[PDB]
Design a protein around this ligand. Structure first.
Ligand SMILES: Nc1ccc(-c2ccc3ncc4ccc(=O)n(-c5cccc(C(F)(F)F)c5)c4c3c2)cn1
Lengths: 317, 1058
């Protein structure tokens, strides 16, 4: 279940983290995550274990021991933990909390204490790490985006449109683009000045996509750096060309009649390695596998009783 | 039906709205502004356009919107932009002109008429005439009037009218006589042709019927020389009286202009000019004054002003200040005054006494402005302080009476005191220091006190602010002799009446350590006891039973002092309050809470020292022996057990066992189980078992709690109803009912365990806001008020609350409708939990969804809909709604300034007969509700979905928002009176306990709160640096009150979905 080539994980308000087999929609194992909804799921680069950011904790179940319970809990923080991110070399973990702090966790050591804390006024909605492992982008509810240099500690901040909360931000593998998405439903794209190794790493504004009318809930670049995806409270995941910044494919779950009142938000998404498919987390209790080109619903992952807010997806050799 | 016709319109509006409900169409939107206009509901309809705007920019041209929004000044410059970019466009010019005839711009309306006379359009030729005749009329040019009148048909009421004017100029009176009656019957038939769905043309028909009857007095003025005073008086009276917007009054004056040139009217035109600048038509008011002066728009701008007509020059001066030119305005004031005092001192040859007097009174007004403006231009500092005091005192000299002049001077002295205090706390943040300061403070304190006094006597019936102000200096200045003297002087001079306004503020300082201060308080209080006791007994009785010695001591002295004088009234009131307190928390009820608390401390806290403090006084309380049958029948069933349960407790006190102590709890848990069973059976209390003394009471001289006011014959407790309903609640309050000596009944709520004192101060504040609202004309025009109720505290625990008739809680009305219509009461709640079992821990993002999802699967009607099913007609329905919307908006703004939190559906209620809204429970005041730990409020006032819904559709745009500015406008103006009151209980010695709960000195805390308030009253509430005007701030607030993000966070009990 971490031994299968594909890792696919789903979590939400139903107190379970369920694991799925990508190509069939059979649920493999399910784990007990009680006393909280799951805010975020991320599988460690190590493929050993998966993190579950929740309310005032990050419980980390195991993908190797194929059965037990949390290997690691992280407590002693109040209000939600909203984002989790990992550093390639095993031992770092970065979190953003409603408690207004980005935190760095030493995974190879004891302590519910964290090796570092970065404080901001305003809850931190997302935390994301520049491919170079030297910088952490941190977006908060004020609308400010913080670039935190992990060496210099030199915080540098940037507000786009905002008086509006930025919801999630991401950065393409090739470190050329950084994207932020906000509550207005906007998507900002910056070009990356690769300062790197003896750093500057600047950000140059490029486009502002009117991605959605309603809340934009997350953004993510395809491995390719070809595509940018946007999940939203308008029950939609829109996929944008990086060359054009035009719309390529739209996946949606909007009824079929205006008098249905919806049933479901589009919470998260994750591309496949080859950037061919996309997985989709929704409040209708289902995860979905789409073909990014046709926008075909290629599979439905049904199991959870209550809503789904989380995906984790893994393709590594 | 005449009253039967509006009923039809009301009922159509109900369906017409219910149609709009299903789908907003420009079709409905049309037959909606119209039907609200027939119903002569103007502003509500204005909101219908506000929505029409923000959704359909589709009767197009942003000048057709500025024109329909009566914003002529905007539509004019919009039409110039629309014409100079476009071409000729026949209609664009028609509107361009209509703006001019409303703005009273005859200069341009006449030019634009002649200068453009190809006018190949024939309708364009017809309308053209009506306008360019009135334009001509205002411009003198009568030849032009006749030319343009000879184009208006004699069929039109307008055509028949202007003939009556051209005749009256050329002196053809029987021509004019007939023309008037023909224009009447051509307008009489015209008010039936558009049988309702017309403009303010039935409202402006009153402008035409006014002008026609005035145009007949203008006839009377021409031949009969003996109405030259008669006609001028009614003209003058029906002016200060009448309230017709600027524009109509131009026309009304133009009729009177045929007969009296402005120079003989002077007062008439100044009064008109006065209103042009108040409504905000400065460039118009200027032209009025330029005419009256008979000198330039002072184009010779570097020159001195003409002192030819002192009264007009002063108007100009303040128009200049309200205009842009305000350093220039200030400058002309210094010189105008210097010119005036010479025109007095030298020019007054004795037989000139009236001119001397009115001249000295104009000067006082000048000095008040000089002081006013100086403070505005420079603020308050060491250079300005003496200068304005100088200006104000000068005014004080020249008017001697006049509230405002003595007021200004007091407040300046008092602000001079504050300036140095707050400068010296600045010093001490970083011995001869205190000395010069003592000299400083004392120098300004004594005049302040003096000024506030002479100002209070000149307000009489309207001086809450100034009176409280006296107290701040009184209390605040631990009395250095000089200050005390001024006080005792004033107390002698001022009426005793005054102090009633302020009784609780005085009583809060009975136990004043400062010895000179207390002395006077006691003496004053006793004298207030002498004339109007009653106004004193209840509050003094509270005090005389107080844990703090000095309080209850000094309180008794004043009561003793009242026995020489009203003894049995002191005795009656003494007992009635004692008994009521017994009845409020019964012997077992106190035990039940005392046992819960005792087990929490022992079994869940290992605290026997707290536990013993909980039990011992309950034992001592009964040690006195039963005094009512209820206290005996209790003593049987429980007493022996308890007296012996204490036996074991005190065997432990000495033995330090734990087997001794467990024997006690063995007994305690016996009686607890016994009482608990009987508790939900307490659904009534009978006076003959519970307090026999109260049943006994017949025809007392004691007044029915909180009914006493001078002016009004005293109502006495003639009898008390023998049964009290017990509302089965957490605090099981009683529903005591009394009989009045007038005959009528009085119902109260006898509360057990809430310090009722805060609520009382709030009612006090409300009292004020209510005066302020009855005094602002607009507010009085619309009936804006807060429904208030009686609050008579009886101790720190208990009190009495006036029952409001015809009321049910919001919650009550819904719970009914919901069960009647077979809807699960708590459905939104159950929907939310089914979706998110962990709701309270979700992220904001996550919460908003669940909340939205609940709302989208439930009715927003309920309230709106049950209020329709309640109504016996449709006009009754409609009015209850107009009441509702207004009353709610009033308390929305006031509640914001008070920082009134915790507005859940059982804390506000609706009068089912008026439809007006009413607030209860004023615990969480100031930001407190939002500052808390668990579940903080993000809301400023409840403006929840069903409340929005119950308003007219086009709600917040219509009546609500308008009423919001009006109310908030009043509050900003009167910011000081409001701040006196609030300040008066933030720093209240016995009420400071409400902000130390930020835990679950205060000097610095109390300061914040009061700043918080000032911010809110000076548009500094939002961003620190912007000073937001009312409509922005209001907009901002409605925004905050409606944000799903703000509502989804509210504790679920508050029902953000109701
Ligand atoms: N702390 C409080 C609570 C309630 C009241 C208060 C005051 C006047 C009322 N006048 C009329 C009505 C009519 C229906 C009515 O239900 N109430 C009312 C509302 C809430 C709570 C209660 C209580 F439990 F205290 F009885 C009564 C009331 C009133 C409640 C005052 N102070």
């Amino acid at each position: 279940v971490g031994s299968d080539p594909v890792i696919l994980a789903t979590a939400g308000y139903d107190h379970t983290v369920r694991f799925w087999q990508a190509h069939s929609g059979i649920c493999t194992r399910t784990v007990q995550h009680q006393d909280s909804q799951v805010n975020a799921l991320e599988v460690t680069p190590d493929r050993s274990m998966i993190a579950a950011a929740g309310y005032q904790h990050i419980r980390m179940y195991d993908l190797n021991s194929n059965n037990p319970n949390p290997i690691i809990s992280y407590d002693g923080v109040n209000k939600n933990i909203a984002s989790v991110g990992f550093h390639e070399d095993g031992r770092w973990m970065y979190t953003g909390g409603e408690d207004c702090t980005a935190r760095i966790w030493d995974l190879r050591s004891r302590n519910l204490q964290c090796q570092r804390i970065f404080q901001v006024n305003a809850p931190i909605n997302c935390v994301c790490l520049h491919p170079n492992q030297a910088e952490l982008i941190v977006g908060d509810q004020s609308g400010a985006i913080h670039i935190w240099d992990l060496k210099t500690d030199h915080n540098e901040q940037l507000i786009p449109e905002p008086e509006v909360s930025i919801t999630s931000a991401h950065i393409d593998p090739d470190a050329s683009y950084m994207a932020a998405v906000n509550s207005t439903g906007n998507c900002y794209v910056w070009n990356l000045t690769g300062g790197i190794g003896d750093e500057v790493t600047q950000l140059i504004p490029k486009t502002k996509i009117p991605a959605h009318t309603r809340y934009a809930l997350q953004c993510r670049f395809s491995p390719d750096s070809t595509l940018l995806a946007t999940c939203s409270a308008d029950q939609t995941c829109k996929i944008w060309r990086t060359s054009n910044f035009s719309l390529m494919t739209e996946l949606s779950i909007k009824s079929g009649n205006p008098g249905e009142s919806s049933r479901g938000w589009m919470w998260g998404c994750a591309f496949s390695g080859d950037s061919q498919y996309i997985v989709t987390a929704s409040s209708d209790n289902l995860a979905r596998l789409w073909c990014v080109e046709t926008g075909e619903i290629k599979r439905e992952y049904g199991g959870h009783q209550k809503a789904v807010v989380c995906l984790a997806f893994n393709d590594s050799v | 039906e005449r009253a039967a016709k509006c009923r039809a319109y009301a009922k159509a509006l109900h369906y017409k709205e219910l149609e709009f409900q299903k789908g907003p169409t420009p079709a409905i939107l049309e037959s909606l502004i119209s039907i609200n206009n027939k119903l002569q509901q103007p502003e509500a309809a204005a909101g219908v356009l506000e929505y029409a705007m923000k959704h359909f920019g589709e009767l197009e041209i942003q000048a057709t919107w500025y024109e329909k929004l009566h914003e002529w000044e905007d539509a004019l410059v919009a039409y110039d932009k629309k014409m100079d970019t476009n071409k000729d466009d026949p209609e664009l010019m028609l509107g361009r002109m209509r703006c001019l005839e409303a703005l009273g711009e005859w200069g341009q309306l006449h030019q634009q008429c002649c200068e453009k006379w190809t006018l190949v359009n024939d309708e364009t030729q017809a309308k053209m005439a009506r306008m360019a005749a009135a334009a001509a009329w205002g411009l003198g040019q009568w030849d032009s009037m006749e030319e343009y009148t000879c184009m208006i048909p004699r069929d039109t009421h307008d055509g028949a009218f202007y003939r009556a004017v051209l005749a009256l100029h050329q002196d053809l009176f029987s021509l004019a006589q007939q023309c008037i009656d023909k224009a009447r019957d051509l307008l009489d038939a015209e008010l039936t042709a558009m049988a309702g769905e017309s403009y303010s043309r039935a409202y402006g028909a009153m402008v035409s019927c006014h002008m026609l009857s005035e145009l007949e007095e203008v006839i009377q003025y021409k031949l009969v020389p003996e109405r030259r005073e008669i006609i001028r008086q009614i003209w003058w009276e029906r002016l200060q009286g009448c309230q017709r917007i600027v524009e109509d009054w131009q026309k009304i004056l133009m009729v009177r202009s045929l007969v009296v040139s402005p120079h003989e009217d002077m007062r008439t035109w100044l009064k008109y000019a006065s209103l042009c600048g108040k409504s905000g038509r400065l460039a118009l008011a200027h032209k009025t004054l330029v005419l009256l002066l008979g000198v330039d728009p002072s184009r010779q701008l570097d020159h001195p002003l003409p002192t030819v007509h002192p009264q007009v020059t002063y108007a100009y001066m303040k128009n200049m200040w309200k205009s842009a030119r305000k350093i220039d305005a200030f400058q002309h004031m210094q010189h105008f005054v210097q010119t005036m005092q010479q025109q007095a001192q030298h020019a007054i040859a004795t037989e000139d006494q009236q001119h001397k007097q009115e001249l000295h009174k104009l000067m006082a007004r000048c000095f008040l402005k000089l002081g006013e403006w100086q403070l505005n231009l420079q603020g308050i500092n060491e250079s300005t302080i003496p200068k304005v005091l100088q200006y104000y005192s000068a005014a004080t000299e020249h008017d001697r009476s006049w509230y405002k002049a003595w007021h200004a001077w007091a407040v300046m002295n008092f602000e001079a005191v504050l300036h140095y205090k707050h400068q010296n706390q600045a010093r001490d943040e970083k011995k001869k220091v205190t000395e010069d300061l003592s000299k400083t403070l004392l120098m300004y304190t004594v005049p302040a006190v003096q000024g506030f006094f002479r100002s209070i006597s000149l307000s009489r019936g309207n001086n809450l602010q100034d009176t409280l102000r006296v107290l701040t200096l009184w209390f605040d200045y631990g009395h250095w002799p000089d200050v005390n003297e001024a006080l005792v002087e004033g107390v002698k001079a001022i009426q005793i009446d005054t102090w009633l306004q302020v009784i609780p503020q005085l009583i809060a300082r009975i136990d004043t350590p400062r010895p000179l201060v207390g002395r006077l308080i006691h003496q004053l209080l006793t004298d207030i006891g002498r004339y109007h006791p009653q106004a004193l007994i209840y509050p003094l009785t509270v005090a005389s039973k107080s844990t703090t010695t000095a309080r209850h001591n000094a309180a008794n002295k004043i009561l003793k002092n009242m026995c020489e004088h009203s003894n049995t009234l002191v005795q009656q009131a003494m007992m009635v309050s004692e008994e009521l307190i017994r009845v409020a928390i019964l012997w077992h009820e106190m035990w039940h809470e005392g046992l819960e608390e005792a087990s929490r401390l022992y079994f869940g806290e290992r605290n026997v020292k707290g536990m013993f403090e909980v039990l011992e006084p309950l034992h001592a309380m009964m040690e006195r022996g039963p005094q009512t049958l209820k206290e005996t029948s209790f003593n049987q069933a429980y007493g022996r057990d308890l007296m012996e349960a204490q036996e074991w407790c005190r065997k432990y006190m000495k033995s330090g066992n734990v087997k001794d102590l467990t024997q006690a709890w063995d007994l305690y848990y016996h009686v607890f189980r016994r009482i608990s069973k009987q508790l939900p059976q307490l659904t009534s209390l009978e006076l003959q078992y519970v307090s026999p003394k109260l049943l006994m009471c017949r025809d007392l001289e004691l007044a029915v709690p909180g009914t006493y006011d001078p002016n009004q014959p005293i109502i006495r407790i003639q009898s008390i109803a023998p049964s009290l309903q017990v509302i089965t609640s957490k605090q099981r309050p009683r529903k005591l009912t009394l009989m009045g000596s007038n005959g009528h009944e009085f119902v109260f709520l006898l509360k057990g365990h809430e310090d009722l004192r805060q609520d009382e101060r709030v009612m006090q504040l409300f009292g004020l806001v209510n005066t302020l609202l009855a005094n602002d004309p607009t507010s009085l025009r619309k009936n804006l008020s807060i429904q208030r109720y009686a609050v008579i505290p009886l101790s720190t625990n208990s009190g009495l609350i006036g029952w409001v008739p015809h009321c049910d809680t919001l919650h009550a009305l819904i719970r009914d409708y919901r069960e009647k219509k077979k809807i699960l009461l708590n459905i939104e709640h159950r929907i939310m939990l089914r979706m998110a079992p962990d709701y309270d821990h979700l992220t904001l993002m996550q919460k908003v969804e669940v909340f939205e999802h609940a709302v989208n699967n439930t009715a927003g009607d309920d309230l709106a809909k049950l209020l329709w099913l309640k109504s016996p007609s449709s006009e009754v329905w409609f009015d209850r709604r107009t009441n509702y919307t207004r009353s709610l908006a009033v308390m929305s703004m006031v509640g914001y300034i008070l920082g009134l939190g915790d507005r859940h559906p059982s804390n506000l209620m609706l009068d089912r007969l008026s439809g007006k809204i009413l607030h209860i429970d004023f615990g969480d005041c100031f930001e407190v509700a939002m500052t808390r730990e668990k579940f903080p409020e993000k809301i400023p006032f409840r403006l929840t979905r069903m409340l929005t819904n119950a308003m007219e559709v086009t709600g917040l745009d219509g009546n609500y928002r308008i009423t919001c500015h009006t109310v908030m406008e009043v509050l900003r103006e009167h910011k000081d009176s409001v701040m006196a009151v609030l300040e008066a209980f933030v720093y209240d010695p016995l009420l400071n306990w409400r902000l130390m709960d930020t835990n679950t000195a205060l000097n610095k805390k109390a300061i914040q709160i009061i700043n918080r308030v000032r911010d809110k009253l000076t548009g500094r509430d939002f961003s620190h640096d912007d000073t937001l005007d009312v409509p922005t701030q209001v907009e901002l607030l409605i925004k905050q009150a409606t944000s799903h993000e703000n509502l989804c966070q509210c504790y679920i009990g508050w029902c953000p979905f109701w």
